[model samples]
Target: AGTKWAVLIAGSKGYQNYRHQADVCHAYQILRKGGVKDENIIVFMYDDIAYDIRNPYPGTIINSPDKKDVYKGVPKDYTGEDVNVQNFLAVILGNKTALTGGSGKVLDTRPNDHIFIYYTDHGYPGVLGMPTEPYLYANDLIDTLKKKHALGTYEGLVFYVEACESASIFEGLLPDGLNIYVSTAAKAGEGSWVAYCPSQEPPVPAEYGTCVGDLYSVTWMEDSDVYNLRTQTLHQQYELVKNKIAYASTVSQFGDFPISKDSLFEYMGTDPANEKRQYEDSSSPHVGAVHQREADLHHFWDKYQKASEGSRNKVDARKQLVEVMLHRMHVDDSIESIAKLLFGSGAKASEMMNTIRPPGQPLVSDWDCLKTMVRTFETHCGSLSEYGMKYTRFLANICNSGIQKEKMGEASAQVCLNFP
Candidate 1:
């Protein structure tokens, strides 16, 4: 086998986004155990969750109910403020000069090398969140991949994404014959789900009030750890993971469909010695999926209910939950009001804004217009919370409808009064 390079990213922050970081750490372990060298693996995480103030087990992060620490030995290649779109692209393109901070690690690939990229985060139509000012747009990512292909450094690449509307990243943008295979947790305009929450059968520890991993993420990762990678092809893994998702999501595939026939060993190498030891049975925990956007609220409500009654902590938890609910309401009303201003009241505006596209179409033809609309709305109505990101379809719709950004700004200004 040739050299294998991997990029693992957890593009979210805060204790509420624990599942994203946990998923990345688990992925790192899978790659490492499969013989991917430390130097070849590049990790991009906010590096905030393991020892977070709310973390019951400091310096420890577990993806499943096994309680094994996955945080140990995980490289902080591009962490903290360095985990931005610029650095991520630079790493993927192997451009060391363009990197801002953290470990100066890039793909550093040559001909015949294999690459794997995995991302877990909150996403909207054609947009993936980063812990920085500007998020990662699908076009930017596709362009970088195209450039990488032009360089002819890697033999093939595989991308696995776990996020709401993850298919939007490559649905209509990524072209065929790129030697890239993309597997997303959900279809375009749909939401993915998170797992191992406080509500699971074998519940997360009472002290660990948040979720432990993403549904699609933990599913594939656990499968990778348990199976013989040399025998399992990418297509087999995709089908297994797709069927395992216990949610309303439609796992999707795009780009270079033929790459699916390649064995997992091509990207994720296997250690024969490690495979020989029959691993004990560790069935997946019976946990239902929670909508990614609503997961934060779910954790807050669960925390409030778990807090001691008549205690100050309980009151504080309740207050926090209420604030989240109120912010959601504000975001929803502001988007609705903007729609009404743009397309008039009644079902027309809602219908226009909420219309889902037919299969095989990108979210919007004008990515810049969509960005401008988001910025305009945020300019007057304040930044969108994670939950508010679900309404990005409305912004994309306004862009597709040919409504100028100036009108969007004006509509936002008229509707938003209490923006903080």
Candidate 2:
């Protein structure tokens, strides 16, 4: 056994997304309480929110309705624009020279050490959101993890990823014997849920009108709050957490097998037992779980309902609804043009993509094909990570549909030229 290290990231920013930073900060507190030294645990938050004008509770962040402030004393390792995919990859691989900002802290993992990484943010099928351009893509991340394994970075790695369609990150990637494990909030092609909405008790305010505490993140964190991590097996926690998530929306696990039998303390901590705490005020936050993809729409509709007659917010809400719908319509319609341009209809690339793109079905993980499709599309139509990522179902499925590569390298530019 060796030292344990943790990386916690809140990939999205802005006030409406207060829950993401709250989740990252709360995870840090858990890892710290688990006996991982502050020096070894690295946190990357946008460092907004505490003083955010919209936050009713200033100088503090609460993951659930009335939990204690998790933000206090949190390490500002990478904040603001520095929390990018480039720096994240650099840190994970322990490549100091590759880092550009903040503390420049890299993983520094030993082959004997254990590693834990958690991320909470917006995600579509093939990408995880970043506050800036060039979101973290599944293929690039898999390549980095594979390289780290080849370089003997750690004895074992456990990843708890909270995102929509999160399992897609590991399904077709991450080799089984690489001493790694991944737990994703959602199975492929599904949206993860957020709990502690205004409808839930402890009663988050409608004016606040925000979703706090991602369902998977909160389930695990709440358990950690009540149970001694030393005694709680990873499998037990997974089972406990998995049950509370509904609609058959799954919490997926992949990679290493035997480690699933180990206690979460192995990666999260190796510690003495701690006092157990219970939720004193809030009741059943899970009952109010909101779908992540529809989160913004939910907020907008609520805003419209609450606004006074002919107010600016009311007008803005209508405009926003239209814009959101149009964006979806454009992406849906453009997928046809993109597929026909790149893969050609004879292969049924577009049709296969549109038809098979529902939850419970897996996305094609063909690493090379996915990379080709992503790179080609990103090169031409602007980085999907910016806004194009929500369009992932079509492209990711197309790659898995086994499209040819003749236009693969050059496809994005053609699509953007025609579609735009």
Candidate 3:
């Protein structure tokens, strides 16, 4: 018998980051409708959105302006502080002892099972964000996938990722012939776009100030909603999602091409005839798509603009917006200053820090160094805010440049002595 297994992860937290959790919840609904059993699905989310203070409709989350509740009946296998990188990889590996917290649910599948993983979050080059410290690194993820394949627990795997520069996670890294296929919302070096945002044509309700979903994510899930999964090939869905997001980000696919030929039913399972019906096309009006890194700020600004003048909420929103802007400035300034200190001149530093690797080459050859440099920066400076995560390319570049981690620590400490 063929079994289907799925993992849905929303790797961010907070009210302004509502889109990620909503995207994941919508995915859970799709998987459940497609016939995936609750016992086989594992979900990782911060679990803070449904009842957030800013949520006008408490205990409910919608991915579209139509206001369908996708959060209903979603499992909280991993939530809050438990939604970290270690738990994610451990669950995938089925290593129960490695788990830190949560429901202790791990993937237990036969060799004939098919695995589908969906992750939505803020990402930078070679890194994926979690709700806490120690972001997920590309090399570690790839290694885990390799181990999963080596264990022969699943026959095939399909992965869908929605994040900024998500392509960096697999490009030149994921090896071929692992029986795994991956599609990302944005190509390497590009920022994925958000849909149904505050300024879009089909507004996300007047009461809401944040985007409800992501462009590439909603497209694929909506396509699954109405189509016959048994007949729809993964390649066709990938093409639809890629074309729909053409206006903003460049959608990308990597890994085994043979897996692309499999029908969606092989992974997502087939829906009953009575349950299938045409829903409103949600990806058409890409009027004001915003980059993922800047979406939080956009949400804050929208909240401030729509609030009553001089009201307490308005002041609070304005303050939040200003703090994000100031943090972005500080990150930019500190990164550049650190770069100057390392490479001696602004021109040389820019050249080294911004060097784009050629096609077929990973972001950094030494994965451990990348992790070390990132932690050093955090230890000396502060948490790399959402916007600052985009500058992680600078840290990866430093690792790729053969610079010692000690030097990076010194530069960060010198540049951010006053940082919190």
Of the candidates shown, which would achieve the greatest lDDT relative to the real structure? 3
- Model 1 error, position 165 (Å): 0.7
Give the TM-score (vs. native) of candidate 2.
Answer: 0.84
lDDT of 1 at 296: 71
TM-score of model 3 (CA atoms): 0.95
Regions more than 4 Å wrong, model 3: 274-284, 418-420
Instruction: Please identify model 1 stretches exceeding 4 Å from their true place.
Output: 273-286, 309-311, 418-420
**lDDT-best of 2 and 3:** 3
For residues 1-420, could you state the per-residue lDDT of candidate 1 as single tens digits?
479999999989888888999999999999998999999999999999988878899999988777889999999999899999999999999999999997999998998999999999998888898876688888899999999999998988999999999998888799998899999999876888888777766566657788888888988998888776877888888887887773557889999989998988899888665576442224355466577866776678877998899999899999998988888888989898989988987587897678867778888889899888888988999888455776778888888889998899889999997547
Residue pairs with clashing backbones, model 2: none
lDDT of each: 0.86, 0.75, 0.87
Residues 92-195, candidate 3: write the lDDT tens digits: 99888999998988887789999999999998889999988778999999999999999999988999999998999999989998899999998777888888
The clash numbers for all candidates, in the given order, read 0, 0, 0
TM-score of each: 0.95, 0.84, 0.95
Model 2 regions more than 4 Å off: 200-203, 246-248, 270-286, 302-318, 336-350, 355-390, 400-420
Better of 1 and 2 by lDDT: 1
